[PDB]
Amino acid sequence: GCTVGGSQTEGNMNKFGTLNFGKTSGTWNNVLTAEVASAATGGNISVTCDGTDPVDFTVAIDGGERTDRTLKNTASADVVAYNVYRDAARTNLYVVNQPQQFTTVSGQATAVPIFGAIAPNTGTPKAQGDYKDTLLVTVNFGGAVTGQVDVKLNIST
């Protein structure tokens, strides 16, 4: 058997972790980054399987609450687009609903890295406040577990 590590059960859902982009003013000049911090330890989500042989699994991430990976501040209608990648260099997007291919490492927890990015926004001021989204991450073992990742950005003064 296999399980997804770092997950917490809360009200008949699994919470895998948080993708927190931090704090910024309503415009910003740099790429904003984040990495999923698991609910349990603040590290990567992972997969562990019993037995010694490697196991094939996939990881698919949806488009969030609005389908287009946008963070939203409820008070305003304002949104900020983002995306998630498997790699630090952002060469490998988690395409919406398309599985990424993994193998477990024998006898070890196997990381499922999730990197977030928000492009610079030098020209369009966003309203102050908390921005949120929730991604659903599905882990399927080729031999299924869905969890929530809470995405966060705060726009301050």
TrEMBL record:
It comes from the Bacteria. This is CsuA/B.
